[PDB]
Amino acid sequence: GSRKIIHVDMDCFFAAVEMRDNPALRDIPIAIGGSRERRGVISTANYPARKFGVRSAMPTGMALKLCPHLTLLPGRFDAYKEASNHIREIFSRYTSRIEPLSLDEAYLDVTDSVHCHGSATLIAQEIRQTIFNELQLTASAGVAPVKFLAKIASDMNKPNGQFVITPAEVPAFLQTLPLAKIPGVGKVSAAKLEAMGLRTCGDVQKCDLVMLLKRFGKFGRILWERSQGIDERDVNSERLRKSVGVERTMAEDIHHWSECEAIIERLYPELERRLAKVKPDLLIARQGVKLKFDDFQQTTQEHVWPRLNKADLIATARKTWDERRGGRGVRLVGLHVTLLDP
DNA sequence: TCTAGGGTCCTAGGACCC
DNA sequence: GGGTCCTAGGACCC
Numbered sequence: 001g002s003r004k005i006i007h008v009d010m011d012c013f014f015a016a017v018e019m020r021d022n023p024a025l026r027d028i029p030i031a032i033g034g035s036r037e038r039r040g041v042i043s044t045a046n047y048p049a050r051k052f053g054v055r056s057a058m059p060t061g062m063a064l065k066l067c068p069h070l071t072l073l074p075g076r077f078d079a080y081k082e083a084s085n086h087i088r089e090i091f092s093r094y095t096s097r098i099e100p101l102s103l104d105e106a107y108l109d110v111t112d113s114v115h116c117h118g119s120a121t122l123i124a125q126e127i128r129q130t131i132f133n134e135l136q137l138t139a140s141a142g143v144a145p146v147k148f149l150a151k152i153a154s155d156m157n158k159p160n161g162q163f164v165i166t167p168a169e170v171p172a173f174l175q176t177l178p179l180a181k182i183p184g185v186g187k188v189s190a191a192k193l194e195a196m197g198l199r200t201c202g203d204v205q206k207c208d209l210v211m212l213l214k215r216f217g218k219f220g221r222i223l224w225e226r227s228q229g230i231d232e233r234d235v236n237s238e239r240l241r242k243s244v245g246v247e248r249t250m251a252e253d254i255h256h257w258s259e260c261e262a263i264i265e266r267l268y269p270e271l272e273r274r275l276a277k278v279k280p281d282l283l284i285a286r287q288g289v290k291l292k293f294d295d296f297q298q299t300t301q302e303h304v305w306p307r308l309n310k311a312d313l314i315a316t317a318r319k320t321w322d323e324r325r326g327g328r329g330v331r332l333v334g335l336h337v338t339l340l341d342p
Numbered sequence: 343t344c345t346a347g348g349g350t351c352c353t354a355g356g357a358c359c360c
Numbered sequence: 361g362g363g364t365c366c367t368a369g370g371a372c373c374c
């Protein structure tokens with residue numbers, strides 16, 4: 001009962017789309033992100049820009065100090081979305097067991113595919129080809145017996161490549177796998193783990209499960225499992241959006257409620273529009289707001305509420321402003337909704 | 343250099359129920 | 361005291 005799992009992952013996604021649509025962007029360093037003056041960060045960068053050290057999540061300020069000729073694009077989301085719709089129609093030609101993780105990424109469980117003589121490797125290659133014809137965008141892929149290994153595999157041979165891991169390669173693959181490459185282990189976790197001489201899955205193999213649950217709860221089980229190649233999570237295909245939010249970071253910290261209110265007036269129409277798309281009657285489970293202060297502490301307050309409603313979001317924001325700002329400057333105001341359950 | 347905006351999932355206490 | 365809902369917040373992903 002080995003499953004055949006594919007992870008497909010578009011190369012340089014936003015930047016690739018911008019380079020296809022404008023060829024002159026191809027060989028010069030580019031990134032999608034907001035300007036330095038807008039306090040922006042980098043969404044992604046093309047390869048000529050990564051060469052300079054530009055990365056996603058990097059303050060644009062730093063990107064420019066690292067790469068002064070950086071061309072900065074604002075991003076065209078409908079174009080990325082269009083591409084994402086296309087690559088999912090392509091997957092559906094191969095299986096209906098498709099679990100998208102974002103615009104540019106999806107798991108596929110092809111275990112029971114009678115397609116490329118049942119070869120998970122050919123299906124992958126054939127998906128990547130056909131995405132490139134049809135879209136002029138390259139993708140990379142990872143083939144493995146479980147979700148997370150397929151994900152790690154998809155990074156191993158990018159851009160425009162793939163990587164297969166068979167059950168037989170699994171133990172050698174894990175011995176040296178750093179924990180930080182496990183999805184769900186980021187900076188903080190990696191540092192706590194490294195603080196106790198745990199760097200690889202091989203280090204974790206040697207640990208006791210009881211102590212691991214004691215010092216991490218459910219996370220430590222997951223760590224213990226994945227360190228062993230164990231990942232019983234099924235490719236889902238039935239997931240639904242749970243929430244929607246709209247937030248803006250000001251060029252300068254605000255200090256007056258009039259300013260906050262004015263921000264909210266512009267945020268609201270945008271949230272209404274985006275919600276109307278998926279819930280015309282605007283019916284919801286919870287609505288609330290978000291402030292982030294100059295000490296980067298962020299606070300949210302949200303409450304049960306039957307329908308998107310501007311005035312209540314403003315009143316809630318005023319309470320929050322008045323009750324938990326303690327004279328700090330404010331860098332960010334946000335609106336938020338929790339969707340109904342079914 | 344100076345730290346986005348779109349989300350998901352998990353944890354933890356009190357309310358509330360039984 | 362165990363479920364589960366409510367609200368707040370953190371880590372992480374893309």
Ligand SMILES: Cc1cn([C@H]2C[C@H](O)[C@@H](COP(=O)(O)NP(=O)(O)OP(=O)(O)O)O2)c(=O)[nH]c1=O
Nearest residue numbers: 010011012013014015043044045056057104374
């Ligand atoms: C990680 C990340 C990605 N994104 C956007 C831009 C990317 O083009 C897109 C896909 O994410 P990715 O697969 O993590 N990165 P990528 O596709 O640009 O690069 P790679 O080729 O997959 O390494 O999502 C951000 O807007 N902020 C982020 O911090």
Ligand SMILES: [Mg+2]
Nearest residue numbers: 009010011012
């Ligand atoms: Mg990608």
Ligand SMILES: [Mg+2]
Nearest residue numbers: 009102104105
């Ligand atoms: Mg991705």
